[PDB]
Design a protein around this ligand. Structure first.
Ligand SMILES: O=C(O)CNC(=O)C(=O)O
Ligand SMILES: [Mg+2]
Ligand code: NI
Ligand SMILES: [Zn+2]
Length: 331
């Protein structure tokens, strides 16, 4: 069995290996990368996502979100307070202001310590889930807006033809902006490219051990667990590495830098934070190996999780018994 310890693997494809996306995902899996839940891909030196970023300040963040925490430093939830629209240029200046800028620090480890100690006492502002792409149309390799669609994968594997589309999203972050513990919708893969700026730290639980994280989360957030049997789908709960280690939950951590891809694998729980002003692009995707995870994915039916148009068909085809209840929570 490859990668039995479930370590995060890092890959350095050559330019030739970077041509066929599906092939290279299958290669990483042959080496056991999926067992970690997360992999890093460093693009060949000959590759570029676009020529420059000198022209991005005019993008609009229609609904910036202020991430307000409740709880204790290691175990907290966050809610999103909507803020007035701002451009990327406005947001970058905000990020770099004295109130929001990254503090002085020695190294990534010192910054991680400061994050876990102090995050709850501040409310950073995140530009999330902005439909769009920063890949140049002429970039042919690993262009996140030109991937094979999940609808097409389900059609090829299962023969059924469904509605829905699959497009990328932009994320603009600052110091302390936070992604809560989650798996993807329908336990899909994700791929994330850090276009520019300061790093993103990731934490991940191996897919084979995801239910250990779920059990701890029910213990730590007991009212939330009573409200919903899949409340991690709400994407609001944070648990620190120190708390995970205290409770024996297997996990790994890694820091992504600008110019690097991360792939999350089906049912790989992940969480993290941004080090300072940055811009990432991400999208969900599927492979044949996903289909069994899609069929077994938990679902939120309490109303809170509310998701895209395209998840309807996934539930309807893969999970017909659950469909009527889930759709009630959509409506
Ligand atoms: O970058 C973020 O804020 C969160 N991204 C992801 O959860 C991802 O790519 O799957
Ligand atoms: Mg612009
Ligand atoms: Ni994710
Ligand atoms: Zn719910």
């Amino acid at each position: 069995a490859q990668n039995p310890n479930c370590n995060i693997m890092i890959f350095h494809p050559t330019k030739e290996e970077f041509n066929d996306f599906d092939k290279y995902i299958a290669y990483m899996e042959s080496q056991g990368a999926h067992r970690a839940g997360l992999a890093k891909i460093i693009p060949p030196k000959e590759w570029k996502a676009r020529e420059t970023y000198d022209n991005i300040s005019e993008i609009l963040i229609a609904t910036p979100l202020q991430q307000v925490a409740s709880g204790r430093a290691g175990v907290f939830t966050q809610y999103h307070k909507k803020k007035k629209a701002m451009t990327v240029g406005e947001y970058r200046h905000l990020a770099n202001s004295k109130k929001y800028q990254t503090p002085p620090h020695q190294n990534f480890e010192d910054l991680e310590r400061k994050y876990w100690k102090n995050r709850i006492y501040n409310s950073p502002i995140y530009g999330a889930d902005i439909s769009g792409s920063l890949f140049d149309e002429n970039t042919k390799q690993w262009n996140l807006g030109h991937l094979g669609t999940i609808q097409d994968l389900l059609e090829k594997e299962c023969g059924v033809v469904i509605e829905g589309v699959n497009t990328p999203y932009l994320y603009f972050g600052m110091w302390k902006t936070t992604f809560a513990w989650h798996t993807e919708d329908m336990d899909l893969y994700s791929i994330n490219y850090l276009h520019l700026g300061e790093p993103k730290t990731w934490y991940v639980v191996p897919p084979e051990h995801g239910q250990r994280l779920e059990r701890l989360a029910r213990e730590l957030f007991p009212g939330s667990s009573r409200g919903c049997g899949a409340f991690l789908r709400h994407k609001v709960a944070l648990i620190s590495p120190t708390v995970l280690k205290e409770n024996g939950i297997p996990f790994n951590r890694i820091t992504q830098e600008a110019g690097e891809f991360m792939v999350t694998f089906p049912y790989g729980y992940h969480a993290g934070f941004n080090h300072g002003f940055n811009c990432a692009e991400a999208i969900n995707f599927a492979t044949p190996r996903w289909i069994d995870y899609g069929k077994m994915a938990s679902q939120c039916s309490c109303g809170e999780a509310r998701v895209t148009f395209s998840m309807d068909a996934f539930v309807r085809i893969l999970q017909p018994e659950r469909y009527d209840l889930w759709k009630r929570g959509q409506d």
